[PDB]
Subunit: 167 residues, 3 copies
Amino acid sequence: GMTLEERVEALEKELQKMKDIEAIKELKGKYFRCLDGKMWDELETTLSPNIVTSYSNGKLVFHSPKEVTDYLKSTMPKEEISMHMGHTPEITIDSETTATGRWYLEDKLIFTDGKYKDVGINGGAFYTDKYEKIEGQWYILETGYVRIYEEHFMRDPKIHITMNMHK
Amino acid sequence: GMTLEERVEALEKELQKMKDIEAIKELKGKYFRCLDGKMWDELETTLSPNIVTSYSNGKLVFHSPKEVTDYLKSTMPKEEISMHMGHTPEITIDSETTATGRWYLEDKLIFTDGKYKDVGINGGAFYTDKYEKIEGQWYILETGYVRIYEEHFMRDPKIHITMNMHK
Amino acid sequence: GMTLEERVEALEKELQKMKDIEAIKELKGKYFRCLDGKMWDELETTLSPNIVTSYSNGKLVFHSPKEVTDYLKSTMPKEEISMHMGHTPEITIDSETTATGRWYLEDKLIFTDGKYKDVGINGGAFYTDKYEKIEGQWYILETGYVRIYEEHFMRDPKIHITMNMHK
Ligand SMILES: [Zn+2]
């Protein structure tokens, strides 16, 4: 049998894992919230300085938080309402400072003014993320996904958007 | 270095926080379930006796669980199917008896009979809640949100609602 | 006071409950992922050997993982895009090896080819599950639900599904 000190040490480490998992869920919650509400400075804080991830089906690859936030902002203008809704996460602590997470995303885009007015886009994806921990704080390091489906369509003009945090 | 007793005491407190967080998520799960299934008496149990929150753009303010439940019920009759779907929470334990939580809501309303038959309403919101703990039980104390968007529209009559817990 | 050894033993048990809850959430995450992505062999691993659950309004009852997976597969062919999206769980550890969970499901079916092309089905449900633990691993034992609503409808042909993991 193990000593008390040994059992406490075990509890310390096991609890740290549970704490790290909550922190990662909280991280990803912030990420979506800041993205869909276009608080770009805040969003930048969720990203590792060592970040490397890609977009436009691998056509574009970015190497810092600045670079990524700048880019997302370009694809998410005022005219575009975004909802990126995360579900049923599967988080795994790979080491004391690294982790992997799967997420299930429903997404929804609605254009209100500008050149793509009334265009609607809906879909789903299985994201897989990598995270890393730096000075006691978790950060997103890599994000990749598999598309479940994507549908593009013209919305009915007779639909009235009665409230909008962006207009 | 800390003593064993001190390290245990730390674990006791740190684990209590993790327990409180789960309890709050469970609370909010019950809240949505009871709201969307119109079990009003059950819903009343999720609310602090000391509750204070507001509605109709701050025009209406309620001061007890009775008062609030009564009100929600008035805005959620049999004729109205509601789905209030919670995502990616960010919970913070502010003290041993208080907490703050952010939630990401997609919402969906469908009217089946009555004066607004075939009306559909969809939206999203970033809720921010305050919770408090009373005799070992968590309760909702304040709820507020920012609307992402709200769309009102007429549904196609050729859609058949084949099942409905309320009719 | 309780002794140190007693306080440690308490922490061991209380933390195990929190660990079990995370495992159950992860389990259900896998279940949805494998179902919607039609990885049937993987899905079979989420199910207790002692599983017993029913379908077609109680008309059909299955007694093993093989039997169930076989069945779901029959109702979920390539032609049918499925999204079963889980929300706001309420998990309760009933014993060291059994548990109960409530889940809030939004669901969405879209048929792309075959005899039901362009048919769309949307709905919601309050699932209630039973889980059991076998050789350190959690498994789904029973699944049942209450339908919130179900809507069937013909989709507009002018909608382009631009991406699809199944085609
Ligand atoms: Zn959702």
